[PDB]
Subunit: 68 residues, 12 copies
Amino acid sequence: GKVYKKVELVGTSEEGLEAAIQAALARARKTLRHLDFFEVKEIRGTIGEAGVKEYQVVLEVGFRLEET
Amino acid sequence: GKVYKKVELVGTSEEGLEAAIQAALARARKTLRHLDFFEVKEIRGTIGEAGVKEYQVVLEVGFRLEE
Amino acid sequence: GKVYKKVELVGTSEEGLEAAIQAALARARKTLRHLDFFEVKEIRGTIGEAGVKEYQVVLEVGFRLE
Amino acid sequence: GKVYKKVELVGTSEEGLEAAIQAALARARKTLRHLDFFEVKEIRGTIGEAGVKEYQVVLEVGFRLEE
Amino acid sequence: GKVYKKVELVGTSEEGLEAAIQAALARARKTLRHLDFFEVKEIRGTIGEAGVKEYQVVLEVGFRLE
Amino acid sequence: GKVYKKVELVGTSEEGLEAAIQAALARARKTLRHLDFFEVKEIRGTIGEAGVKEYQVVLEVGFRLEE
Amino acid sequence: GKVYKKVELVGTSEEGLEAAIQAALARARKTLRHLDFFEVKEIRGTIGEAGVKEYQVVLEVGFRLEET
Amino acid sequence: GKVYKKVELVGTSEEGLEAAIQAALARARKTLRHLDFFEVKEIRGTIGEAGVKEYQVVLEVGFRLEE
Amino acid sequence: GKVYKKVELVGTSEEGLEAAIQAALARARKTLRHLDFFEVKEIRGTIGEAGVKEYQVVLEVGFRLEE
Amino acid sequence: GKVYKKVELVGTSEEGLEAAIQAALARARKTLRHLDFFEVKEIRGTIGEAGVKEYQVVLEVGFRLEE
Amino acid sequence: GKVYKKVELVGTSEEGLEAAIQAALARARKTLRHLDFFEVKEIRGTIGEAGVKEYQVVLEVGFRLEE
Amino acid sequence: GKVYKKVELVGTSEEGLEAAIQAALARARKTLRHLDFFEVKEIRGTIGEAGVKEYQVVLEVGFRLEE
Ligand SMILES: CC(C)(COP(=O)(O)OP(=O)(O)OC[C@H]1O[C@@H](n2cnc3c(N)ncnc32)[C@H](O)[C@@H]1OP(=O)(O)O)[C@@H](O)C(=O)NCCC(=O)NCCS
Ligand SMILES: CC(C)(COP(=O)(O)OP(=O)(O)OC[C@H]1O[C@@H](n2cnc3c(N)ncnc32)[C@H](O)[C@@H]1OP(=O)(O)O)[C@@H](O)C(=O)NCCC(=O)NCCS
Ligand SMILES: CC(C)(COP(=O)(O)OP(=O)(O)OC[C@H]1O[C@@H](n2cnc3c(N)ncnc32)[C@H](O)[C@@H]1OP(=O)(O)O)[C@@H](O)C(=O)NCCC(=O)NCCS
Ligand SMILES: CC(C)(COP(=O)(O)OP(=O)(O)OC[C@H]1O[C@@H](n2cnc3c(N)ncnc32)[C@H](O)[C@@H]1OP(=O)(O)O)[C@@H](O)C(=O)NCCC(=O)NCCS
Ligand SMILES: CC(C)(COP(=O)(O)OP(=O)(O)OC[C@H]1O[C@@H](n2cnc3c(N)ncnc32)[C@H](O)[C@@H]1OP(=O)(O)O)[C@@H](O)C(=O)NCCC(=O)NCCS
Ligand SMILES: CC(C)(COP(=O)(O)OP(=O)(O)OC[C@H]1O[C@@H](n2cnc3c(N)ncnc32)[C@H](O)[C@@H]1OP(=O)(O)O)[C@@H](O)C(=O)NCCC(=O)NCCS
Ligand SMILES: CC(C)(COP(=O)(O)OP(=O)(O)OC[C@H]1O[C@@H](n2cnc3c(N)ncnc32)[C@H](O)[C@@H]1OP(=O)(O)O)[C@@H](O)C(=O)NCCC(=O)NCCS
Ligand SMILES: CC(C)(COP(=O)(O)OP(=O)(O)OC[C@H]1O[C@@H](n2cnc3c(N)ncnc32)[C@H](O)[C@@H]1OP(=O)(O)O)[C@@H](O)C(=O)NCCC(=O)NCCS
Ligand SMILES: CC(C)(COP(=O)(O)OP(=O)(O)OC[C@H]1O[C@@H](n2cnc3c(N)ncnc32)[C@H](O)[C@@H]1OP(=O)(O)O)[C@@H](O)C(=O)NCCC(=O)NCCS
Ligand SMILES: CC(C)(COP(=O)(O)OP(=O)(O)OC[C@H]1O[C@@H](n2cnc3c(N)ncnc32)[C@H](O)[C@@H]1OP(=O)(O)O)[C@@H](O)C(=O)NCCC(=O)NCCS
Ligand SMILES: CC(C)(COP(=O)(O)OP(=O)(O)OC[C@H]1O[C@@H](n2cnc3c(N)ncnc32)[C@H](O)[C@@H]1OP(=O)(O)O)[C@H](O)C(=O)NCCC(=O)NCCS
Ligand SMILES: CC(C)(COP(=O)(O)OP(=O)(O)OC[C@H]1O[C@@H](n2cnc3c(N)ncnc32)[C@H](O)[C@@H]1OP(=O)(O)O)[C@H](O)C(=O)NCCC(=O)NCCS
Ligand SMILES: Cc1cc2nc3c(=O)[nH]c(=O)nc-3n(C[C@H](O)[C@H](O)[C@H](O)COP(=O)(O)O)c2cc1C
Ligand SMILES: Cc1cc2nc3c(=O)[nH]c(=O)nc-3n(C[C@H](O)[C@H](O)[C@H](O)COP(=O)(O)O)c2cc1C
Ligand SMILES: [Cl-]
Ligand code: NA
């Protein structure tokens, strides 16, 4: 019928969760076409002297494979 | 004695995660009483030309059954 | 080699998820040294008249043991 | 063929686990027909001065949709 | 934005897995508007003389709340 | 060294959870030796006239293999 | 009360999913009595020239232990 | 605002499930204040000549942190 | 010494479940060699006029890496 | 077509992980034919004076049924 | 009855998996009494010039609470 | 900020678990730059005349994406 591929990316940001998700998808958009959906798998991060240093969101990203 | 019900909702927002959760709870508040707690089950969404198009937060919402 | 301990905390905030996470880490920082990493286990909360009353983020917090 | 619905209920009791389960089903019985099976999803509770204050059993309850 | 509700149904059939899924959705459409998607949660069933007696497919069904 | 075998049993009882567990273990004891440990995998059951009809505890039972 | 035993089988078939499930239950009934319920744990398989080579359905099968 | 901590305890009892849970909570309150909620993570145990020897209930216990 | 790669694909089809799986594998076969095994991760789909519109099978596909 | 059975074994060893897995398989080999594959479900063990006393590897072991 | 506590440690080693487990238990042994059992939760690590740089084993360690 | 990709590899070895892990990473470093971390997802394998024929370690390998 149709075929999609999913790739597992980790987006990171010092700002917040949305920014980390957006960083992953902004990079995905540079090389992948027909990006349709995503699913958050994990939220983790690193700690520094101010609390969160880096948010890291592990994301599956689904895109439709071109037939032609 | 007391009994609670949980319903599975999906709140959506183009703005962010908190807004998505709030959308679901805003809608629940119009028809349901004694809403007590929620649990996020998953965070999903759609992708558009500018990154995230829609955040979709799947929530379970618990409320006390009256009477 | 090195050994880390993980403790399960729940940070709360009326304003958002990042704020809830930061609350947990801010409290951890008062008594724990060599805080390194965190993992969100669950997002929960309470409901009030204006929707979300409290965001409650269940976190694992990893720190290096001296 | 036949179709069932499952509803997620939380039964509570200050007495025990069985009593919390029975509280959920006792309430379900007041308004739902053809209740058939249940599955425990979670056992939770609250703590008080004397230990457990309330047992809280999260249950999936299945009933056959009639006609 | 939009809000969706998910309901957990179990479709059954003696014919097969597809028929089981269709039974739940056929019943769902008799009362629910704006049905959009489904997610299979598990496949179970009963055993008889001939092998499978009936297939039972536990489904979550999403629809938009109007 | 030692090797253990785990087998999955379901005990049932109309009385309670402990009774269901004990039923599975009583049966295991009739034919197996060196029964050491158990792990509850799920709690399910049936619904009758007065709430719970049958408690059904799915149990993994571990025993040390002889030789 | 009653006691059931569950066993984990893998039914295989080149035809389809139902056929793989049926293969397990058919073998089960050759030696086991009072077979009552099954639960699919996973659907796996092998790949060949024509796509799916073999469907492999991992199944839990429950039967009532006889008392006499 | 508030910060809570969860500890994983295993309550045990030769009597039953509720007793194992209560045993964990009774010990917790000897030293911990602001004990609020618990969540059962698993039910395990040992087997003896009469079936269950000891029930072992793995429990997360949540309490509010002071200061 | 030898190494395999797994890739997560979603096959879709309006016919049925097997057709969805075969769709993903047929495509994989056009550009990948040494395809060996698959594992179904989930079954999802869309709803239309007459019940199921599209079956969507999420599949991991494992293949041997050359050299 | 072919039918396989999977049994859950716990291999143990005071030396290491691979030794514990090999212990389970060495035992399986004494009474079962067409042993094909294994799946590690869990790594557990006991603690002694010098750290690990015994490794205990919970394995599923699959074999093809004859006839 | 008795009450146990479980703590989650991450043992690390450049050598191997058993070494990482042992590093965690060695540190546990310095300050904790009645260490009884462990459960491996995760195996992960870092990558360097020669492949694995450090193995990291996330472990639950159970000990009996004294007194 | 930075973006990483995770790929699922299966490393194999007749020697042991660490060798299987190292086989996957050895292959990875021939074609991928900025390899950072790994997570073991599953330990599987095959059985032969002498017990374990082949250890197969299913690994997620994470690497930083360029530019
Ligand atoms: C290294 C890597 C991260 C780089 O990804 P990238 O920046 O997107 O670079 P790519 O070369 O993959 O570019 C995207 C390709 O997808 C194609 N493409 C984009 N969208 C597509 C779609 N919807 N359908 C089909 N093709 C599409 C592009 O045309 C391009 O191919 P082309 O250069 O032939 O035109 C990625 O290639 C990768 O993860 N490879 C797998 C590595 C691996 O697992 N190695 C084994 C280690 S042991
Ligand atoms: C009660 C509790 C929440 C208080 O935590 P706290 O606010 O961090 O206070 P603590 O006394 O633990 O202070 C932190 C300690 O860790 C030490 N420490 C901080 N970082 C460390 C590190 N990286 N490595 C080693 N030690 C460290 C501090 O020096 C301090 O010890 P000290 O007072 O001897 O100098 C916490 O101790 C706890 O959860 N314990 C409960 C135990 C339990 O589960 N009880 C059993 C019930 S059945
Ligand atoms: C009993 C039950 C299975 C019957 O379901 P049903 O056949 O669909 O019958 P319902 O009336 O509930 O469903 C149709 C309703 O949904 C409404 N509806 C349909 N699609 C809708 C949509 N997309 N958005 C909003 N409402 C919608 C219909 O208008 C109708 O409501 P109305 O009578 O006010 O007009 C169902 O009501 C149920 O599972 N609820 C039981 C509640 C429960 O859990 N009991 C508590 C036990 S303790
Ligand atoms: C509010 C609520 C807790 C009340 O539950 P309740 O006490 O069972 O009340 P119900 O109206 O569902 O009563 C049971 C209904 O199911 C019907 N019914 C009972 N058993 C049935 C069966 N086996 N098959 C079909 N219908 C059945 C009854 O006829 C009755 O409907 P009717 O009065 O229209 O004839 C429950 O309906 C609910 O959880 N719905 C909330 C919907 C929701 O999720 N809100 C959206 C928020 S965004
Ligand atoms: C059918 C079944 C439930 C009957 O169970 P049961 O009542 O315990 O009867 P068993 O024949 O297994 O008897 C237990 C045997 O194990 C022996 N045994 C008891 N404890 C033991 C131990 N710790 N170590 C080794 N052997 C032991 C007993 O002495 C007896 O052997 P024996 O009769 O040769 O003396 C059980 O054998 C079973 O589930 N078999 C698997 C069937 C199956 O999967 N079929 C495939 C269908 S596709
Ligand atoms: C060993 C252990 C079980 C003893 O538990 P315990 O009997 O409850 O002892 P604690 O020191 O934690 O006692 C509770 C302390 O927290 C305080 N406290 C109690 N409730 C509190 C709360 N809600 N908020 C903050 N502090 C609290 C008590 O006043 C007491 O402090 P005090 O010593 O000043 O009187 C426990 O400390 C433990 O599990 N420690 C972790 C061990 C570990 O992981 N070590 C590293 C191994 S590598
Ligand atoms: C876009 C995409 C789906 C296209 O896949 P495709 O149609 O199979 O095309 P690919 O080039 O990737 O795959 C075929 C290649 O694999 C090779 N190949 C096939 N089987 C192989 C095997 N067993 N071992 C090694 N290589 C093999 C083929 O020879 C071909 O390479 P070549 O052109 O150099 O000869 C795929 O490249 C992809 O998903 N890339 C990842 C994108 C990504 O994650 N980017 C990062 C975004 S942030
Ligand atoms: C007790 C037990 C551990 C002993 O196992 P064992 O040492 O391998 O001995 P078994 O007799 O069971 O198995 C060996 C037999 O399997 C047969 N066998 C071996 N490989 C086979 C294959 N691939 N296909 C079919 N049969 C095979 C052999 O013929 C052999 O001898 P047989 O001719 O007498 O049947 C095991 O039988 C068991 O766990 N039984 C289940 C007990 C149970 O669950 N009881 C219910 C308690 S409530
Ligand atoms: C900081 C930390 C790693 C240090 O661990 P440590 O090196 O093992 O030192 P601890 O004090 O925790 O543990 C040793 C204590 O437990 C006692 N103890 C050891 N084994 C015991 C057992 N089986 N039963 C009861 N007590 C025991 C020791 O006697 C000692 O207490 P003492 O000083 O009164 O003699 C640990 O205390 C910890 O993780 N604390 C929790 C901090 C926390 O979560 N704070 C909240 C931040 S928001
Ligand atoms: C076939 C496959 C296993 C071969 O992997 P491989 O041996 O690593 O070969 P690649 O072609 O991917 O080589 C690595 C590429 O990534 C680039 N790369 C390496 N590290 C990188 C990094 N950190 N960031 C960006 N790019 C990187 C390399 O420069 C090289 O690209 P180049 O040839 O343009 O220089 C792999 O490409 C694959 O699994 N493809 C996906 C197949 C697929 O899903 N097809 C769809 C089937 S329906
Ligand atoms: C379509 C649907 C979502 C509409 O939800 P809704 O917008 O909340 O509309 P409702 O009719 O359920 O309104 C809420 C009801 O719950 C009642 N209610 C609110 N809070 C309550 C509480 N805490 N305790 C008991 N009842 C409560 C309200 O009084 C109202 O009932 P009333 O009209 O008798 O006064 C629908 O309720 C639903 O999803 N039900 C199940 C549909 C289903 O699964 N059908 C089977 C298909 S196969
Ligand atoms: C090899 C094996 C697959 C053969 O299975 P099988 O073809 O069904 O052969 P069995 O010998 O088990 O025959 C079924 C038995 O269950 C009995 N049985 C069938 N249904 C029953 C039921 N409902 N209640 C009680 N007993 C029943 C049959 O009568 C027969 O026993 P009997 O020969 O004493 O009359 C075997 O059953 C097995 O998997 N055993 C476990 C092997 C094992 O784990 N060994 C340890 C390895 S380290
Ligand atoms: C991790 C992994 C999982 C596998 N799962 C299955 C399986 O589900 N069913 C099956 O028949 N074979 C399975 N196999 C075996 C492969 O399909 C294949 O036959 C074997 O790896 C030999 O492949 P090769 O000739 O490409 O090296 C699996 C192999 C690996 C490494
Ligand atoms: C459900 C299942 C899982 C399997 N998993 C693996 C695997 O983990 N690794 C592997 O190399 N082969 C795997 N296989 C392949 C078997 O090891 C075996 O080689 C194959 O089933 C051929 O079986 P037979 O020779 O007994 O007929 C798997 C097969 C099945 C049916
Ligand atoms: Cl068996
Ligand atoms: Na032991």
